[PDB]
Design a protein around this ligand. Structure first.
Ligand SMILES: Cc1cc2c3c(c1C)C(C)(C)C[C@@H](S(=O)(=O)O)N3c1c([nH]c(=O)[nH]c1=O)N2C[C@H](O)[C@H](O)[C@H](O)COP(=O)(O)O
Ligand SMILES: Cc1cc2c3c(c1C)C(C)(C)C[C@@H](S(=O)(=O)O)N3c1c([nH]c(=O)[nH]c1=O)N2C[C@H](O)[C@H](O)[C@H](O)COP(=O)(O)O
Ligand SMILES: [Mn+2]
Ligand SMILES: [Mn+2]
Ligand code: NA
Ligand code: NA
Lengths: 465, 465
C-alpha cells in the first residue's frame, strides 16, 4: 500500500523529482521556479529549505502527464482510457478500510496551540490577498446520505486558526453545507482537510464522479485496494491514514469573509467575494511532514495538466454515446474547459451539428464550453496545424458557424455580457457533402501508411535530433 | 405462453374487440372503418367477411394506449416506464426457444403454388399504387454477427410471388442486406416475414433496441419468458412459432422495383422510389389463419398510437441523463417525431438551451425533431392549453427562439430546402431569471393541492358527465 512518500521515492529513482536545497521563499519565489519548470516539462520539486520554515514544500507533483499516469499505478497516459471505461459502469462500490491509528496523527496540536502560520503556505502571485492553501482534500458529509465527498477548494489564510473555504456552489462540499444548514439551523458543520494523501486519493478527489459516490471508492478502484483511512479526532469524518497534515474543525453558520483577490487558472485575478470561514480546532501531522502545494495561473499550470489527463478518461464515455467520435480534446490554452476540438467519422449531412449539441449537453463538465470545433478524422485534434488547416479549407464562415445565444456560462467569466449567461459558437469544419455545398469538394492528400511505418522504423537510427 | 389468438380472446372478453360480419373490401373500405374507429378510441377490429377472401382481417390492434399496455402483459400505460428502466441496462441476454414443429407450418405452399393474391392484403388510400403489407415482421441475419433483427418494413405487391422490401437505409434489415452484398457478391439474401406473431414479439420488433441485440431477446423480457420460435423451412432464420402466416424467400442481388406512391404517416403521398424485390418461395400458415394489417396516414393512426406509448419507454432513459426533465412528449399531431415538448425544473439561467441540445443529440430517435418547446414543471406537456399559455406568456420570440441551420433532416421531409438538410427551432418558454430579463417576472397562479385532492375525491359523485 503506497503512500505519498513511496510515490516520491519512485519518482526520485526515475529522475522525476528534484530536491532543492537553496533557500526559497514560499512568498512568490516557489511559484516562479515551479512555473519555469512546468513550462519545460521538468520534474516534480521538493523544496527542502523554504525560507522561514522547517517543513519541506512539494509542488509540481503532477506537472507532466506521465506523472499523472504513474500516480494511478499505470505506465503511461493511454491507460487512462481504461479508467474511463470503468467510470462508465458507476453511471458493491468498495468502502474505506479504517485503521485503528495512523501516521497522520503522530503529532497533534489543538485549541489555542493551532497556528497555521507555522506551515509554509504559499503566496502565488504579487497581488494575491494572502497565503493560500491549494492542495487540500476537503472531506464532508451531508445530512441525508452517508457518502464522504472529497474536493479541492482553495483556502485563504485569515488567522492563526481560520481559513476561508472557497467551494463554488455546485460542489459536493458546498451542497453538503447548504443542506446541513437547512436541516440543523445554527449547528456547526464539521469539516476536515487532508494534505499530502496518496496519489490515488488525490486524483480520485479531482475526478468528477457523481455526487452519489464517495471519491474514496473511486480511489480504491484506481489503486486496486480499499483506501486506508483513520477517524478524525474531533468528528466522525475519515481522512487518509498516510496524509502528511490534516486540519480538523468546523464552519460556524453565518460566518463569512471576503475572499481574494486571487489569480486563477484563467490567468486573471478573481475579484473579492464572500465565502464561509473554516475554524481549525486541530492540526495533526506526520513526523517530518511535507507540505504539498501548487498554484494556478495563466496556463499551462499543474491543474491544467491534470485536466488534460482527465480528458482521456472522458473520451470513452463520449464514444459510448457517440461512436462517431474518434477524438475529443480540450486544449490547456483554452483555460482547460472553454474550447473543445472534436473529430468524427461523418456519416451524413449535418452530422457536425449533432456532435456540437452533444458536447454542449451530454456531460456537465462541458456545459460551459464556449467554442467547439468539429473536424473529420484525417485531422489530429491536438495539433493546431491540422485544426487551422481544416477550419480555413473546409469552412465558409457564415454558412458553417453556429451561434447560440443566452446559454449557461460560468459566472466568473467576465467576457459574457451578463453574469451567468452568454453565447456559444460551434465551427463545422467537416468536409461538406452534397446538399451542404453544390461545389466539387477537394480530394485531400493522404499519406501512404507503408511509408509512414517504414519511417517510424528508421526514425531513431536517422538521428535528426 | 400467450400467442396472438389468446390476446384476441382477452380483448374480446373486455369489450376491446369487435367482429364485423358485414362484407368489407380490403380495397379502401377497411381503412375507412378503422380510421373512424381509431379516431373515436374504439376497439380492435376483426373483419370476418372480407370481400373476395376467406381469411379474416385484423386491424386496429394497437389503436389505443391501453391495448398497447395489455400487449405487454401490463394493466395500463404507466407500466411502460418500468420497461424503459429495463431498456436502459441493455445500454446474459436471453435467446429464443426453438420448437421442433409449429402451428405456423400447418399449411405450406411453395414454388409455383405461391400466390400472394389469395391473401386479403389491404389497399389503404385511393392513389396508393397497389396492395400493401403493413404488419410484417421482417427477419434477417447479417454476415458478421448472429443476431436476428426484426423490423416492420412496408411491402408492396408486385406479383404472385414478389414483394418490394421497403426498408429505409439505417434499418437492421437494410444494413444486413448491404453487408451481405459486400461479403458474398451475387449470392441470394435469405429473408423471412412473420404476420400475426404474439404481441410481445410485435412490440419488441418496433422498439428501437440497439442493432447489436435481437429484438427476440427484448420480447422475452417483456413477456417474462423466452420467445418460442421455429426454424424456417428454406433457410436458417427462426420465426415465431405462433405466427399466423410466414413468408419465406430471398432477395436476388441487384433486383429492384419502383415502389409507391403510398400514403405515409405524415398524411402525404411518398413519391416513387426504388427498393429491393423480395421473392417469396414459401408461404406457411395456420389452420384458420388471420391476416394482421394496418394503415398509416394523417395522424392519428395506429403507428402513432404505438409511438406515443413507446415514448413513455424513453422518458426514464432521458431522465437518467437529464434528471431535470419532468416530462417529455412527442404529440401524435406532429407526425410522431417532429415536435417535442419538454418540461423541466429549471436550475440556472440558460438551462432550457442545454435541454434542447440534449433532445437533439442524446438519442437518435430524436435527431430529426425540428421543433422543441421547453417549459417549466407547472405546465402539462400533453395539453396545448398549458403549452400555448407558456409560449405566449413566457417568451419574447426573438430573444427566446433558437434557430440552428444545416442540421440532419429526414430525406422524405419535403419542407426542408434541400434533401437531408434543414433547420431546427427551439422555443425557450421557461420562466426567465435575473440575467435573462431585467423585468419583474409574473407570479403564476398555483392551485391549492388540498382542494384538488378533495375535488378528485368527490368527482365521480358530482356526476357532471
Ligand atoms: C485540482 C484543483 C482543483 C480545484 C482547485 C485547485 C486545484 C489544484 C486550486 C485550489 C489550486 C485552484 C482552484 S481554482 O482552479 O478554482 O482557481 N481550485 C478550486 C476548485 N473547485 C472549487 O470549487 N474551488 C476551488 O477553489 N477546483 C476543482 C475542484 O476541486 C474539482 O472540480 C473537484 O472535482 C470538485 O469535487 P466535488 O465538489 O465535485 O466533489
Ligand atoms: C409499426 C410500423 C413501423 C414502420 C412502418 C409501419 C408500421 C406499421 C408501416 C408499414 C405501416 C408503415 C411504414 S412507414 O411508417 O414508413 O410509412 N413502416 C416502415 C417502417 N420503417 C421502415 O424502414 N420502412 C417502413 O415502411 N416503420 C418503422 C420500423 O419498422 C421501426 O423503426 C423498427 O423499429 C425498425 O427496426 P430496426 O430496423 O431498427 O431493427
Ligand atoms: Mn464529489
Ligand atoms: Mn433492430
Ligand atoms: Na471531488
Ligand atoms: Na426493430
Amino acid at each position: 500500500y503506497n503512500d505519498l512518500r513511496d510515490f516520491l521515492t519512485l519518482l526520485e529513482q526515475q529522475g522525476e523529482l528534484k530536491r532543492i536545497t537553496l533557500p526559497v521563499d514560499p512568498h512568490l519565489e516557489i511559484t516562479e521556479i515551479a512555473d519555469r519548470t512546468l513550462r519545460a516539462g521538468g520534474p516534480a520539486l521538493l523544496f527542502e529549505n523554504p525560507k522561514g520554515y522547517s517543513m519541506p514544500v512539494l509542488c509540481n507533483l503532477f506537472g507532466t502527464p506521465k506523472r499523472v499516469a504513474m500516480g494511478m499505478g499505470q505506465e503511461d497516459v493511454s491507460a487512462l482510457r481504461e479508467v474511463g471505461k470503468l467510470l462508465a459502469f458507476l453511471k458493491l462500490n468498495m468502502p474505506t478500510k479504517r485503521l485503528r491509528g495512523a501516521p497522520c496523527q503522530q503529532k497533534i496540536v489543538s485549541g489555542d496551540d493551532v497556528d497555521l502560520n507555522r506551515i509554509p503556505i504559499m503566496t502565488c502571485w504579487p497581488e494575491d490577498a494572502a497565503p493560500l492553501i491549494t492542495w487540500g482534500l476537503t472531506v464532508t458529509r451531508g445530512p441525508h446520505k452517508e457518502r464522504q465527498n472529497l474536493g479541492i477548494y482553495r483556502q485563504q489564510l485569515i488567522g492563526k486558526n481560520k481559513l476561508i473555504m472557497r467551494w463554488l456552489s455546485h460542489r459536493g462540499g458546498a451542497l453538503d453545507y447548504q443542506e446541513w444548514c437547512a436541516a440543523h439551523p445554527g449547528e456547526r458543520f464539521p469539516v476536515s482537510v487532508a494534505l499530502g494523501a496518496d496519489p490515488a486519493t488525490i486524483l480520485g478527489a479531482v475526478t468528477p464522479v457523481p455526487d452519489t459516490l464517495s471519491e474514496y471508492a473511486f480511489a480504491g478502484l484506481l489503486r486496486g485496494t480499499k483506501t486506508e483511512v483513520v477517524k478524525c479526532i474531533s468528528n466522525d469524518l475519515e481522512v487518509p491514514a498516510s496524509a502528511e497534515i490534516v486540519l480538523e474543525g468546523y464552519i460556524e453558520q453565518g460566518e463569512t469573509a471576503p475572499e481574494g483577490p486571487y489569480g486563477d487558472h484563467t490567468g486573471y485575478y478573481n475579484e473579492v467575494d464572500s465565502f464561509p470561514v473554516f475554524t481549525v480546532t486541530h492540526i495533526t501531522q506526520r513526523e517530518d511532514a511535507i507540505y504539498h502545494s501548487t498554484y494556478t495561473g495563466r496556463p499551462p499550470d499543474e491543474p491544467a495538466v491534470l485536466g488534460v489527463a482527465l480528458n482521456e478518461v472522458f473520451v470513452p464515455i463520449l464514444q459510448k454515446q457517440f461512436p462517431e467520435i474518434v477524438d475529443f480534446y480540450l486544449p490547456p490554452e483554452g483555460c482547460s474547459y472553454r474550447l473543445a476540438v472534436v473529430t468524427i467519422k461523418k456519416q451524413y449531412a449535418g452530422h457536425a451539428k449533432r456532435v456540437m449539441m452533444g458536447v454542449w449537453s451530454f456531460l456537465r463538465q462541458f456545459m460551459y464550453t464556449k467554442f467547439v470545433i468539429v473536424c473529420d478524422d484525417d485531422v489530429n485534434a491536438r495539433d493546431w496545424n491540422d485544426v487551422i488547416w481544416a477550419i480555413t479549407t473546409r469552412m465558409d464562415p457564415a454558412r458553417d458557424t453556429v451561434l447560440v445565444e443566452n446559454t449557461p456560462i460560468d459566472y466568473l467569466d467576465f467576457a459574457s455580457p451578463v453574469s451567468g449567461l452568454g453565447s456559444k459558437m460551434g465551427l463545422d469544419a467537416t468536409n461538406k457533402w452534397p446538399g451542404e455545398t453544390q461545389r466539387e469538394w477537394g480530394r485531400p492528400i493522404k499519406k501512404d501508411p507503408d511509408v509512414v511505418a517504414h519511417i517510424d522504423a528508421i526514425w531513431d537510427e536517422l538521428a535528426i535530433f
